[PDB]
């Protein structure tokens, strides 16, 4: 179904002629879509494969992270004043109380962006360096892309049959998030409103409130 | 034959005899030895890239013609290509050639729906074959796509393929011009050309928009 020769393809029925040879249904998410031929080389394909999973995982975290403050604000904590929207939350660091987690002054109460940058550089840098090093103090399980040992406390990667279907489930939920995050970015620039607000508008008047409502927004004017 | 082999013309003129990528030998049309970057070193990517160029080419040639005709015809209100899409939202809608009753399109969603369904079938047929033809060249199927049999002679087909790519590359370059000229001048390509023709020393990029571009 999702592996082997007779796997799922990106063009459905009209995919036989669009399946690059090097794509033989071995890795997860091989719908046979490399028209450009970017992953022709075995080495280049491997590097892109790791990059895709890393992006997919960041995207998945991003999708929740770009909606959770807005959700709680609309109904819940209701404390992220203008910080509920993802593309207006980072500016909350320069607030009078600065960045308050859950909008609670007692939590974090950060008011120095430089410190945040330095803290992130050392934290993310070390973890990323370990990921690149392919080896670290924690259990690595001998797989740079899929380091199960320490990063999988629940042991859901125990049997390969679940692993094979879980790995395609990861990339497919991941690719959807990457596609949607790209959506968040574009929608944000064109509409200027929060992504969950854009949805409300589409439900309000689907024919009127859609992407073609803002069609003439960026028109070069003589 | 002058367009193939090792004696073919090259993009750097005389200063290209000692500067030729190994993979570009003179087998495929439009070979001018311009592969300065490492792209297309592997034949698999090169074969994939060759098709994308012809596709981007045939599209550009259609686009270049279609971005000028409506602007050069009356009745269409000499609409600019970058301002044609908005017409669907006008009260009159899209009336081909300006003649009322022709299409009278007013729903952008309906137009996109038919385009997606029709183009998906068409693009699918172009990749995995279909009713028009099966087991034919991916970029040069011929048959139903060559009704006038203009390329029956292999020799003629070779020179004609050189003509197709060279016209396409010119169209691709000029289409890129249409994109930038519109984003800078804000006027249609024909209007920009007419302005230059009138007062070239005054109406050009440098004397009009170059200063405000920074």
């Amino acid at each position: 179904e999702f592996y082997g020769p007779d796997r799922a393809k990106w063009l459905g029925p009209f995919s036989e002629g669009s399946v690059p040879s090097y794509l033989k249904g071995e890795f997860p998410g091989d719908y046979g879509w490399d028209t450009a031929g970017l992953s022709a080389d075995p080495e280049t394909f491997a590097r892109y494969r790791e990059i895709e999973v890393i992006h997919a995982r960041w995207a998945m975290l991003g999708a929740l992270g770009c909606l959770t403050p807005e959700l709680l604000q609309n109904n819940g904590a209701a404390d992220f004043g203008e910080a509920a929207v993802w593309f207006k939350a980072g500016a909350s660091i320069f607030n009078e109380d600065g960045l308050n987690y859950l909008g609670n002054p007692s939590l974090i109460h950060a008011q120095s962006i430089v410190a945040v940058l330095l803290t992130q550089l050392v934290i993310m840098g070390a973890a990323e360096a370990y990921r690149y090093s392919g080896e670290g103090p924690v259990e690595t399980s001998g797989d740079s892309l899929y380091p199960g040992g320490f990063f999988d406390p629940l042991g859901l990667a125990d049997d390969p049959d679940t692993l094979a279907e879980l790995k395609v489930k990861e990339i497919k939920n991941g690719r959807l998030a990457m596609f949607s995050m790209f959506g968040f970015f574009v929608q944000g620039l064109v509409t200027g409103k929060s992504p969950l607000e854009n949805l409300a508008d589409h439900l309000a008047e689907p024919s009127v409130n859609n992407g073609f409502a803002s069609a003439t927004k960026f028109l070069p004017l003589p | 034959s002058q367009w193939y082999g090792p004696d073919r013309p090259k993009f750097l003129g005389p200063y290209s005899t000692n500067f030729v990528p190994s993979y570009l030998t003179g087998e495929f049309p439009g070979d001018y030895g311009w592969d300065t970057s490492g792209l297309s070193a592997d034949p698999a990517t090169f074969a994939r890239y060759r098709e994308i160029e012809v596709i981007h080419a045939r599209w550009a040639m259609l686009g270049a013609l279609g971005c000028v005709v409506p602007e050069l015809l009356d009745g269409t209100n000499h609409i600019a290509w970058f301002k044609a899409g908005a017409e669907i939202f006008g009260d009159d809608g899209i009336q081909y050639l300006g003649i009322p009753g022709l299409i009278n399109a007013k729903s952008i969603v309906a137009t996109l729906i038919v385009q997606v369904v029709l183009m998906s079938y068409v693009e699918g047929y172009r990749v995995n074959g279909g009713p028009a033809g099966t087991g034919l060249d991916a970029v040069y199927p011929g048959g139903n796509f060559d009704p006038l049999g203009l390329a029956d002679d292999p020799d003629t087909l070779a020179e004609l393929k050189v003509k197709e790519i060279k016209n396409g590359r010119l169209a691709m370059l000029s289409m890129f011009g249409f994109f930038i000229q519109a984003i800078v001048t804000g006027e249609g390509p024909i209007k920009n050309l007419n302005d230059h023709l009138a007062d070239a020393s005054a109406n050009n990029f440098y004397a009009l928009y170059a200063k405000n571009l920074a």
């Binding site: - | 003649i99 009322p100 009753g101 022709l102 009278n104 009704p147 049999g149």
Partner: protein, 118 residues
């Protein structure tokens, strides 16, 4: 071009011979005799052919580009395209005259009337 219906254009030109809004330098009486004579000569020339296939596909001066002057499959496909466009036009022009009888308008006029009828 003129904005006049194809049915109404018949009488308009009869009253004032004209083409593309340009008055022709010929009274309708001479044009009427000319049309009959010209078409008479043309059709007599066509009837001279004795080959049944060549009466339908003369070729020669009528196929200057030599598109279907052979027996190839391209000739067969081209002839298949001709009759299809021919049968479509026959039915379509039957539409023109029936629509002009019923609705009163011409081709473009019927199209506009239908769009506004909604």
């Amino acid at each position: 071009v003129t904005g006049d219906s194809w049915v109404a254009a018949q009488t308009l030109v009869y009253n004032q011979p004209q083409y593309a809004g340009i008055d022709l330098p010929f009274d309708i009486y001479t044009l009427a005799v000319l049309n009959s004579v010209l078409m008479g000569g043309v059709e007599l020339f066509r009837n001279s052919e004795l080959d049944p296939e060549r009466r339908c596909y003369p070729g020669g001066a009528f196929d200057p580009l030599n598109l279907a002057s052979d027996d190839s499959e391209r000739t067969q496909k081209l002839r298949e395209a001709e009759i299809k466009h021919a049968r479509l036009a026959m039915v379509s022009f039957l539409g023109y005259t029936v629509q002009a009888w019923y609705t009163g308008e011409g081709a473009l006029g019927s199209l506009n009337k239908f769009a506004n009828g909604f």
